[PDB]
Design a binder for this molecule. Structure first.
Ligand SMILES: [Zn+2]
Ligand SMILES: [Zn+2]
Ligand SMILES: [Zn+2]
Ligand SMILES: [Zn+2]
Ligand SMILES: [Zn+2]
Ligand SMILES: [Zn+2]
Ligand SMILES: [Zn+2]
Lengths: 503, 311, 182, 368, 120, 154
């Protein structure tokens, strides 16, 4: 077995440029330039993912201070620098040789700063102005208090105060006179304090209204960029790439995608939103609207076997589909997962909103915003999930702006509901994909075969082969196929990516 | 005057800012009467913008007879800034040309220095005389040594440079040269994640030397490399070893004109350094071939086995 | 004109360049082996072999001229910008004790190697004759061959973080700031 | 636990300020005090004003030349110090303002007096928010820090305790403190920091120490967007293992607000509760502790976090409604005692943290 | 003079080089009556035209011969130079007066037999 | 150079005297030829080597020595007074149309003179300083082994 190790390693590595470096490392060991530890660590980096070959190699070769990358050693000449207050214990415990100095640790390049959005910059500017006003006012007030203590009966503060008040450069003479005029500086400083305080009141009002609109936008990171990323990443190519990547990872080591539906009211909510859009949209004729509603209701009632009567008034099964049906199902699952995520926090968020206390010292008295309360976008009562659904319906209709919808969601869910900012566009795309499922002959035939199989309810093993063969006959010979499996006992969906393995 | 608000600090409203930024258990005063002094410490009982020498920025001590400015340290002898010369200052060449440069009779002075040094050294007398008319200048390799190694380049400041100096984003997992997925060497997976669950994905690096891709969690590492040296995956030869100490360093790359190769006839046991090639006379690159490496490895293993089993 | 330097010495010079301008290291001064010691050993080892006085006096003349040129040009052209501060410190240590600085007794064997690397340019920027240039080049090449013979005992490779007796030492932040910032 | 708490505050510390646009402001110290007194915590704590440090006391760690330059430098005469500004990095990176030396002396005196009170047994918790400058190293200013008062306080602590633990939860690596005790086993430094192209540059997982101090320096390099549930899952096991194996006699905790969500420079996503959980966990061990407040550049958040942590040290949980301090207008729309995390993405996968903790636990085996 | 034994007798004169050899002091020997009936060249001056005219360039035939004779590689540089010299009498030295894997496995096999029998 | 023992030098001088003064060419192929000696050497020495590299070196050296004794025998390893005999052998090899294998004709007297001028032949090459030492060491080991077995061979 010792003779076949090299070809085993050659096959496992799978590249020539890496096998060359492996041979170079082995040669370096063979010339007494590498000890066994470095050889074993390098072969760990090469064949360590394999468990048998590495152990065999370690048992064959007989394997049986650590300086850091960010510290240098200075010469002892540059070590003894006079520290007058240093003692024997201080000399014993303090380190004088090894130095780190981030500049060396930066490779003489620099550092990357964290990106900040514009609302954070506005907040920083407001804070800076507040700090300047408060710093000047408090310094003047402290100097005033000290001056009153002097007149009536810790070094640079008063000097800088009277140097700021007197900018004529004559202030130094005033300090000298103060060391030898106290009422004069007293009455000057008190007037300065009064005018600065008035200006501070006006500026505090302005800053309050300015911050009170951008605060919640400042804490929204994934939401701001969201409604450009959803358009780019909710395409057919991205979903195909995801399922292909999962399949490739599985094959490098039948249930690629797994979905679990723990609630059925979300289906009615999605149907309601879709019907609202279909009624509102000026992009389909009158019969086409009814056809789209019928398709949506029939598909949801047949695939998930929910109901057929209450749905319009409010044994594993397999489906072999082309790209269109897969994309339609993926859009439906996206809507369902987003609504489920916003729904599972119903009780906590509802309790928070209802039991949201207010400060009585100055909040209720002076500093409040009825802006969201003037449009009913404050979620008081009006259970959060149902209110979100109602606002989504309003946005789909068009009588609600996107800005106020997003602001209400931000203030009601603490920026945890940023994924519903595109509910109208996702509903529109779902309706469009339902439409293309009608105006295509091949997809119509595939859907008819699915309906026949689903309604048969009693089929033998031949249902797995002849049905797939007929669907492929209605399909082309080059593009992918998807197998969607539905289980009623737990309402579980499994998606398998049969690109060309059926041929 | 002017504050950060852009106002004299006494105005306030700034009507334009108003329109832009609008829509349409006791107090601290008792802290001065409850702070006890704490003094129980155990230690309480005690013309050009560059330098004519190095061609770099910084503060300069300028000359007047010419537009040349030198650093304080870039001067022979160096001058401390606190102890300013405080007088008419020129560089060496200005002093020489003002005081000594009589071009009609300069050769006679050079010959006088030549014959004065003829007693001891006459091959360097001209060179010694040629040193007083030159200003200080930073040392640089004379442009025929750097070209010997076709991997060394000069930076903007003149420093040494080598060939090691350079939310949910799924497209980083795609080669973009063939459309395939970048498969991590350690785990054999791409771990692309999904837009539904972007926390199921793993960042990938695609090493800059051999183009192999790695995960930041497979090779222990926190961030990407963007500013420092080029990243090299752990699948490369050390090129520098400390053996218990003794230091081994791999030879630099020589231009192919002087890069001598040689193939030994021994091919079983041949003491070479890590300067091999798989298939002035101090930089030979032995060509070793794979079979010889196999035999060397097996020889070393078997010999060490005997060495240990003798005991 | 044209100087034939062995490739290993070129590698040594490039290593010195990398150590100074990239790693921010300097030379451990005073050197264990200075320029004066290297030249004295070379002269004693070479003159003891040949016997012709005409070829023996030229060796002494070459060594003396090399020493004089190094002493006169080290402070002008043989130092990188980082090293100059160190140089200045030495001058101060020389000026406090009334002892003049003699650079051939402090620096050694790596500043001499970079001294005889710009000799072609220094010769080119003169009015020297032809056979004198030929003689200088021949002596320099003989010295370079001799130095290449004894290369391992003058240019060792030990890390400053491990050995206290290495050729190079690490600079501190307070040193580098003054050297490259003021 | 029901510990006795000494609290150090100087009323002049807030009157010093950096440049106009500089993010670092001592004013937040004046703010956290105003909340603390208005919540009624002065009835549970002993409030002191430490005597400011002297030059000889500073020179126990720093050099005489650096301290002498700091006591003479002024914005007026900066042009007369051109060699010292580049020696000591007190030029553009770390500026020079009117109250540099008195501010440094106040911070150092507070830390040293807190350590002295811990030594004498007067209290079991010492709080000094003026301290916590963990970047200055003995001859130079770094990271807006000019005097390393943590080192002085630990030096004062080492006169009575064999082993001292130092814990840092700032986003930045504690380079000065780690460098000061990098070769000793008397002090064990542990830092949880963001490592990458970030300012301290240092703090790699393989910086365990040199010489006798080998394996007595712990670094946890983290990524952007870490939250409370992940930060505590990293923080509790590491600190627990350090406590069982190193067994310190005293602990210093640098509670820098740089790790809070919404910071100017920081890139973490910790809320107030996730930041105070570290203080609560360290307090739950029973050994003497000294809490210092280092970084933090959003005053309204760092002040609230410091007030909440001070309340927790006094075994109380403060109400979420502010008590109407002097700076009431700073505290946003709701005027609550809370810091809201953002929805930013967390790039700290469990595998990377698992590998980091495995490395740290492997190194820690040689400290008991 | 026969430039193989440095004696006198009946020689075989050359044309390009002024050299004379015996009919029996050759490798292979030639019948004295059997003339070449044409152009005859000795061992030397035949490799010279072989390497300077017919092949491409110098220092390339040696590499090809060494590569071809890689089985015996330590003697390759001697085997290449042996076919370039005229035969000479044996004067005293003046100071007297998948074919690779099979070899790999056999080497390991014999070496391990030696190991085992030496250990015990 | 090569370290030839004194006894082998005496044997070479004895053969020189027995050929060039009292002409007594030995008989046509004897009982022990070069091939038998070399195979027995490679067989009896390989059983005391514990390294595969040494085994490969020994095998390569033996094969190269055979292939070099083939092309060097009639070239410069024969006296003049013997050449005619060689010639007749050649003629026999011509008549029978059987290839000539000089390893199995000459033996143990002509291999000794083969490793007697090798330093000269090596010096007239371009071999490196490291392989020539290996060749010298191998030849020295073979010479010692042959001197050990001298009474039964020659
Ligand atoms: Zn300069
Ligand atoms: Zn000038
Ligand atoms: Zn991976
Ligand atoms: Zn690589
Ligand atoms: Zn910080
Ligand atoms: Zn003859
Ligand atoms: Zn001829």
């Amino acid at each position: 077995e010792e003779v076949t190790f090299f070809e085993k390693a050659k096959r496992y590595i799978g590249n020539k440029h890496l096998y060359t470096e492996f041979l170079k490392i082995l040669n370096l060991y063979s010339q007494d330039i590498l000890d066994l530890d470095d050889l074993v660590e390098k072969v760990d980096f090469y064949l360590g993912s394999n468990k048998e070959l590495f152990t065999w190699f370690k048992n064959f070769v007989g394997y049986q201070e650590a300086f850091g990358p960010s510290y240098k050693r200075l010469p002892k000449s540059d070590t003894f620098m006079p520290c007058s207050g240093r003692d024997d214990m201080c000399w014993e415990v303090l380190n004088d040789e090894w130095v780190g100095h981030p500049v060396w640790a930066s490779e003489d390049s620099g550092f990357i700063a964290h990106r900040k959005n514009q609302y954070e910059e506005t907040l920083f500017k407001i804070e800076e102005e507040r700090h300047e006003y408060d710093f000047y006012i408090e310094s003047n007030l402290r100097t005033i208090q000290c001056l009153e203590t002097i007149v009536n009966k810790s070094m640079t503060i008063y000097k800088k105060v009277i140097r700021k008040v007197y900018d004529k450069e004559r202030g130094f003479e005033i300090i000298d006179a103060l060391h030898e005029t106290a009422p004069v500086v007293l009455k000057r400083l008190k007037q300065k304090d009064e005018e600065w305080r008035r200006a501070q009141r006006e500026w505090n009002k302005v800053w309050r209204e300015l911050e009170q609109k951008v605060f919640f936008k400042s804490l929204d990171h994934l939401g701001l960029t969201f409604k450009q990323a959803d358009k780019k990443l909710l395409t057919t190519k991205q979903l195909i790439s995801e399922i292909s990547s999962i399949k490739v990872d599985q094959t490098n080591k039948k249930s690629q995608l797994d979905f679990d539906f723990p609630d059925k009211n979300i289906f009615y909510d999605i149907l309601c939103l879709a019907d609202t859009f279909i009624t509102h949209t000026t992009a389909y004729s009158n019969p086409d609207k009814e056809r789209l509603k019928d398709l949506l209701k029939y598909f949801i009632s047949l695939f998930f076997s929910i109901s057929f009567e209450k749905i319009e008034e409010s044994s594993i099964f397999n489906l072999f589909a082309n790209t269109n049906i897969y994309i339609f199902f993926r859009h439906w699952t996206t809507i369902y997962e987003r609504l489920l995520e916003i729904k599972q926090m119903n009780e906590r968020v509802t309790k928070e909103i209802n039991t949201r206390s207010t400060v009585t010292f100055a909040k209720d008295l002076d500093l409040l915003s009825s802006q969201l309360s003037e449009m009913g976008l404050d979620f008081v009562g009006e259970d959060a999930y149902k209110q979100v659904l109602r606002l989504s319906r309003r946005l789909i209709n068009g009588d609600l702006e996107h800005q106020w919808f997003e602001e209400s969601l931000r203030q009601a869910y603490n920026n945890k509901a940023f994924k519903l900012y595109t509910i109208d566009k996702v509903t529109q795309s779902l309706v469009k994909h339902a439409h293309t499922l009608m105006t295509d002959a091949k997809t119509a035939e595939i859907m008819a075969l699915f309906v026949k199989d689903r309604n048969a309810s009693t089929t033998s093993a031949k249902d797995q082969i002849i049905y797939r063969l007929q669907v492929r006959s209605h399909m082309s010979n080059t593009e992918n196929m998807f197998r969607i499996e539905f289980d009623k006992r737990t309402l579980h969906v499994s998606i398998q990516y049969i690109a060309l393995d059926d041929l | 005057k002017v504050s950060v608000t852009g106002l004299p600090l006494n105005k306030g409203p700034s009507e334009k800012i108003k329109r832009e930024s609008l829509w349409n258990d006791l107090k601290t005063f008792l802290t001065e009467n409850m702070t006890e002094e704490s003094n129980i410490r155990s230690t309480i009982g005690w013309n050009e913008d560059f330098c004519s020498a190095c061609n770099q920025s910084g503060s300069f001590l300028c000359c007047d007879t010419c537009p040349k400015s030198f650093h304080f340290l870039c001067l022979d002898p160096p001058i401390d800034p606190n102890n300013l010369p405080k007088g008419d200052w020129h560089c060496n060449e200005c002093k020489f040309k003002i005081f000594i440069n009589n071009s009609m009779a300069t050769l006679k002075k050079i010959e006088s220095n030549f014959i004065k040094q003829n007693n001891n050294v006459k091959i360097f007398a001209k060179l010694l005389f040629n040193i007083d008319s030159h200003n200080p200048k930073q040392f640089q390799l004379p442009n025929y040594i750097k070209e010997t190694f076709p991997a060394v380049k000069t930076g903007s400041r003149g420093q040494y440079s080598d060939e090691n100096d350079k939310s949910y984003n799924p497209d980083t997992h795609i080669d973009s040269n063939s459309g395939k997925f970048l498969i991590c060497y350690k785990c054999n997976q791409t771990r692309l994640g999904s837009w539904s669950h972007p926390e199921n994905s793993r960042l990938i690096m695609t090493c800059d030397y051999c183009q192999t891709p790695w995960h930041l969690d497979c090779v222990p590492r926190a961030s990407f490399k963007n500013l420092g040296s080029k990243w090299k995956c752990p699948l490369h030869s050390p090129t520098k070893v400390y053996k218990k100490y003794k230091v081994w360093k791999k030879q630099r790359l020589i231009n192919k004109k002087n890069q001598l190769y040689y193939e030994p006839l021994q091919k079983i046991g041949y003491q070479n350094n890590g300067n091999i090639q798989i298939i002035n006379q101090d930089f030979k690159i032995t060509q070793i071939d794979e079979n010889s490496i196999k035999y060397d490895f097996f020889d070393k293993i078997y010999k060490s086995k005997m060495v240990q089993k003798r005991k | 004109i044209s100087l034939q330097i062995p490739i290993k010495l070129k590698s040594v010079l490039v290593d010195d360049w990398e150590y100074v301008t990239k790693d921010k290291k300097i030379c451990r001064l005073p050197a264990d082996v200075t320029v004066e010691m290297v030249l004295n050993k070379y002269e004693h080892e070479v003159s003891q072999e040949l016997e012709s006085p005409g070829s023996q006096s030229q060796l002494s003349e070459y060594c003396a001229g090399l020493k004089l040129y190094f002493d006169k040009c080290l402070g002008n052209m043989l130092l990188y910008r980082l090293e100059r501060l160190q140089y200045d410190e030495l001058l101060k240590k020389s000026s406090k004790d009334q002892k003049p600085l003699v650079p051939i007794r402090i620096y050694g064997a790596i500043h001499l190697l970079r001294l005889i690397s710009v000799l072609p340019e220094l010769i080119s920027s003169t009015t020297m004759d032809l056979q004198s240039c030929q003689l200088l080049i021949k002596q320099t090449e003989d010295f370079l061959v001799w130095l290449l013979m004894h290369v391992d005992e003058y240019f060792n490779d030990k890390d400053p973080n491990r050995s206290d007796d290495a050729l190079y030492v690490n600079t501190s932040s307070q040193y580098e700031g003054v050297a490259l910032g003021m | 636990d029901k510990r006795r708490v000494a609290y150090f505050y100087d009323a002049d510390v807030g009157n010093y300020a950096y440049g106009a646009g500089h993010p670092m402001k001592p004013h937040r110290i004046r703010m956290a005090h105003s909340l603390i007194m208005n919540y009624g915590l002065y009835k549970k704590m002993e409030i002191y004003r430490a005597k400011p440090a002297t030059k000889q006391e500073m020179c126990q760690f720093h050099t005489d030349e650096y301290i002498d330059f700091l006591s003479r430098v002024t914005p007026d005469n900066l042009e007369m110090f051109k060699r010292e500004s580049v020696k000591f990095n007190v030029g553009d990176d770390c500026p020079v303002f009117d109250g540099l030396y008195e501010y440094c002396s106040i911070s150092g005196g507070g830390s040293m007096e807190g350590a002295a009170r811990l030594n004498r047994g007067k209290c079991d918790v010492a709080v000094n928010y003026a301290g916590g400058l963990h970047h200055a190293k003995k001859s130079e200013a770094s990271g807006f820090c000019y005097l390393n008062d943590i080192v002085l306080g630990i030096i004062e602590l080492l006169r009575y305790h064999p082993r001292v633990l130092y814990i840092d939860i700032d986003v930045h690596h504690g380079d000065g403190v780690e460098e000061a005790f990098y070769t000793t086993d008397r002090v064990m430094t542990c830092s949880f920091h963001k490592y990458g192209e970030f300012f301290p540059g240092t703090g790699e997982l393989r910086d365990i120490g040199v010489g006798a101090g080998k394996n007595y320096a712990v670094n946890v390099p983290l990524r952007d967007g870490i939250d409370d549930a992940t930060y505590r899952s990293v923080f509790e096991p590491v600190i627990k293992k350090i406590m069982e194996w190193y067994q310190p006699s005293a602990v210093v905790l640098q509670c820098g607000g740089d790790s809070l969500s919404g910071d100017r420079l920081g890139c973490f996503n910790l809320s107030m509760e996730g930041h105070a959980n570290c203080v609560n966990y360290v307090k739950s061990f029973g050994i003497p502790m000294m809490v210092v407040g280092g970084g933090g550049y959003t005053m309204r958040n760092v002040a609230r976090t410091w007030c909440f942590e001070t309340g927790l040290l006094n075994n109380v949980v403060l109400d979420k409604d502010l008590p109407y301090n002097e700076y009431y207008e700073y505290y946003g729309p709701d005027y609550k005692l809370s810091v809201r995390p953002s929805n930013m993405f967390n790039v700290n996968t469990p595998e990377y943290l698992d590998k980091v903790m495995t490395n740290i636990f492997a190194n820690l085996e040689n400290t008991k």
